[PDB]
């Protein structure tokens, strides 16, 4: 429906975004399995919008990320990066 042309829909895809992530010296970056014991449902639901205009078929289009509670910080997304 976003691709149909209803420009006022924020898709909430559940449990994408983590916060609490180990950044080890090894080549992976592991989200903390202790701070997130539900390893598929402690991730955050992500609110996703488009952004369309006129010439200033389709147009100049964009995308938006918010979370389910982006109210104080609507645009800023916090990270908690546990670097060794």
């Amino acid at each position: 429906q976003l691709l149909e042309g209803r420009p006022d829909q924020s898709v909430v895809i559940p449990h994408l975004f983590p916060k609490y992530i180990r950044a080890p010296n090894g080549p992976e970056a592991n989200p903390v399995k202790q701070l997130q014991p539900d390893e598929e449902e402690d991730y955050l639901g992500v609110r996703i919008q488009l952004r369309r205009e006129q010439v200033g078929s389709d147009f100049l289009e964009w995308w938006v990320i918010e979370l389910q509670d982006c109210k104080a910080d609507c645009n800023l997304l916090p990270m908690v990066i546990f670097s060794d």
């Binding site: 289009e61 964009w62 938006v64 916090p78 990270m79």
Partner: protein
């Protein structure tokens, strides 16, 4: 240390880190990047 009270492993394995180990990254949700398109990418995203 206050938000992770009811887990003991949370308290231990956060207390393993120094006062410099843990850094934020305030990610802006408003990209300034035009999402690139093509009528194959347009139509086949619509078809999928």
């Amino acid at each position: 240390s206050q938000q992770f009270d009811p887990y003991p492993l949370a308290m231990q394995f956060i207390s393993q880190y120094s006062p410099e180990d843990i850094v934020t990254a305030q990610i802006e949700g408003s990209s300034g990047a035009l999402w690139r398109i093509s009528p194959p990418s347009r139509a086949q995203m619509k078809q999928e």
